[PDB]
Each structure stands twice: as structure tokens, then as C-alpha cells.
């Protein structure tokens, strides 16, 4: 480690790099020392250590901010059943309902991962990218943060024509043999589209239902819930609530992947 470090002379003081290394060493050993800080929210911890669908409660959802629906004046009355009441000039999403729908969604995510399906996480909002990529990594899955070019599934051959396809084991090993030009040009459709802002990409949803793909979406109090197969009522605007739901879904899919790998090994 640190092969190019030119250490200063013993008579001389520390160099800048040497000093930095010393600081790092101190940080690793004795900085986080005096106390330990239990019961506090670190944003990163929801992405890298999301809870299982089972262990989620209503309280956790409330803390995440999932309960906060759009607004009283921006109400799609189609979503009436999901909403608990109004408060602070804002519809508040029934969170027991949210929980049950999330569990249902989580189970279907797990199932397709187990079957070895292509899961696609779609999230066009600003802060969502990193968490989306993490989720995609967790299950051997896919994501979209930069905008969804209309017709990725309906007009697949024009759009997704010149990108490399692969082969895969019952495990996830590339088994790198040459794909034939006929073998390459076929569409590779997702087996689960999961969106974080269905109201912002109506188009993607429409192609999914045309292309015959089951889809999951965070339905806020202004979003149409009929436009998807498995709606999760919740707060799609705040970045952390979305991440929490997304991270849970990723964890559910991860589990199913692990189970598939285990059964392959067997």
C-alpha cells in the first residue's frame, strides 16, 4: 500500500503525504473513540443496509417520510382509497396499506430475480441515480437515470440495436462465446420495470403495458395507480423515502438471487 510514498528524512519533519497518512491512521484507530452513537439516521445506510420486507414497520415508513402525499389541490381522486387523511394542506398516505403493497411488490421482485429475470430500475429524478445503480448492482439487474428514450421496448431494434449482449450460466458467469448476428439482434425485454417517478415517465409505463411487462411504481397522491401492475402508495418526491422503498426492493431481489444461486449450486 502507497508504493510511491517518498518518506521524509528522520531529522526533517513529516512531509504532506506522510502527515495525511498519519491522520488517516489516527482516524481508523482512535478518532471514533469517546462514544458510540446509537439511534441516528445516516442517509447512506439506507442504500447499503436496507431492511428486509418483513422487518419494515409503519413507524420506519413514517420516519422515511413515505406518508407525505402530494397536495390537497393536486389530487387525483383515483388514488382516494390509499389516502389516510389530510393535514398541513397535504394528503397523507395510509401507511399500513403502503406496507402491504410494498410487501407484495417486494415478493414479486424476489420471484423474478429467483427465476433469473431482467429487473430494470427507472428513476429520472435528480438525486436518485446512485441508489438506483446500487440496487441494480445488488440483484444482477439494470437501471436508467438519464432519460428513457421513448420506444426502448416498443422500438427496441432501432434504439437498443448496437449494444453488446452476453451469455450467462445458471450462475452469473459470462461464458464468453461469440453471439451470432441473428442471435444478437433480438430484443431483450425486461421481466420487471420498477419506476421511482411514474408521473414523470408515463411513456415508459405505456410501453411496458404494450410490451406486456409487469411493472412496479411509487404511486403518490397525484399519480394514476391503474397504470401499473403493483403500485406502492408513497412519497415519490422526497429522495430518502424513495431510496428506502427502492433499497427494500433491491434487498428482496438480492435474497431471491442468492436463493437461485444456492439452488444452482445444489
Amino acid at each position: 500500500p502507497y508504493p510511491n510514498l517518498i518518506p521524509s528524512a528522520n531529522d526533517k519533519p513529516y512531509s504532506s503525504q506522510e502527515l495525511f497518512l498519519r491522520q488517516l491512521n489516527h482516524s481508523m484507530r482512535t478518532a471514533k473513540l469517546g462514544a458510540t452513537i446509537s439511534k441516528v439516521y445516516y442517509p447512506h445506510k439506507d442504500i447499503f443496509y436496507p431492511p428486509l420486507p418483513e422487518n419494515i414497520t409503519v413507524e420506519s415508513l413514517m420516519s422515511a417520510g413515505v406518508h407525505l402525499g402530494q397536495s390537497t389541490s393536486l389530487w387525483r381522486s383515483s388514488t382516494q382509497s390509499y389516502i389516510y387523511g389530510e393535514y398541513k394542506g397535504i394528503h397523507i398516505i395510509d401507511l399500513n396499506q403502503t406496507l402491504s403493497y410494498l410487501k407484495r411488490a417486494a415478493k414479486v421482485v424476489e420471484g423474478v430475480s429467483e427465476s433469473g429475470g431482467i429487473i430494470l430500475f427507472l428513476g429520472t429524478r435528480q438525486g436518485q441515480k446512485r441508489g438506483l445503480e446500487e440496487a441494480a448492482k445488488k440483484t444482477h439487474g439494470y437501471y436508467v437515470s438519464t432519460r428513457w428514450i421513448p420506444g426502448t421496448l416498443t422500438n427496441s431494434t432501432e434504439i437498443s440495436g448496437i449494444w453488446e449482449k452476453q451469455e450467462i450460466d445458471s450462475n452469473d458467469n459470462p461464458t464468453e462465446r461469440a453471439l451470432s448476428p441473428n442471435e444478437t439482434s433480438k430484443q431483450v425485454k425486461p421481466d420487471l420495470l420498477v419506476v421511482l417517478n411514474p408521473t414523470e415517465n408515463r411513456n415508459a409505463l405505456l410501453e411496458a403495458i404494450k410490451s406486456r411487462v409487469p411493472t412496479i411504481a411509487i404511486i403518490d397522491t397525484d399519480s394514476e395507480p391503474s397504470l401499473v401492475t403493483y403500485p406502492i402508495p408513497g412519497n415519490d418526491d422526497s429522495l430518502r423515502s424513495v431510496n428506502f422503498l427502492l433499497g427494500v426492493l433491491a434487498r428482496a431481489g438480492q435474497r431471491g438471487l442468492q436463493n437461485r444461486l444456492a439452488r444452482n449450486n445444489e
Binding site: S73, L74, W75, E224
Partner: protein, 87 residues
């Protein structure tokens, strides 16, 4: 107070956006000189430095030095800022 909600429009844009830049220095100097010459007769040495300053300003060209993104924002944020009811 009386709020005024517009109907659904094709495109919110100001027809012409004014930048409101500062007036030219050379022009100002010329106006000052003109004002001075209104008083004090035709060309008395009270405005001896002013004329020199004007000359310095208008040596390379008649004027010394030679847009507001408001439409792009309106265009961007119209769909948000609408109180347009759902689809």
C-alpha cells in the same frame, strides 16, 4: 386580494425580454458637456477636462463598450407552475 388564474395556454413566454443594461459612459459625458455649454457661453474652460474625457472615450469608436434567459425558464417551468388539473 384578487388572484387572476389564466386558462391553459400553448406557451408561456414574454414577447420581448428587456435586459435593462446601464447607459453608455461616452453618451453621458457628451450630455454633461452639452449641459455645461448651455451655461457659461459657448466654450469656456470650466468644461476643459470634460471635453478631454469625452475625446478619450470616443477615440477608437463613437461608443465605448459594445441577453436575459427569461423565456427558457418560463418555458421550462410552465407545466409545473400551472394549476392545470390532472390527466
Amino acid at each position: 386580494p384578487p388572484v387572476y388564474r389564466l386558462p391553459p395556454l400553448p406557451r408561456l413566454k414574454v414577447k420581448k425580454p428587456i435586459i435593462r443594461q446601464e447607459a453608455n459612459k461616452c453618451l453621458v459625458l457628451m450630455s454633461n458637456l452639452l449641459q455645461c455649454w448651455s451655461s457659461y457661453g459657448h466654450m469656456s474652460p470650466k468644461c476643459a477636462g470634460l471635453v478631454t474625457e469625452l475625446k478619450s472615450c470616443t477615440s477608437e469608436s463613437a461608443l465605448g463598450k459594445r441577453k436575459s434567459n427569461i423565456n427558457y425558464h418560463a418555458a421550462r417551468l410552465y407545466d409545473r407552475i400551472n394549476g392545470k388539473p390532472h390527466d
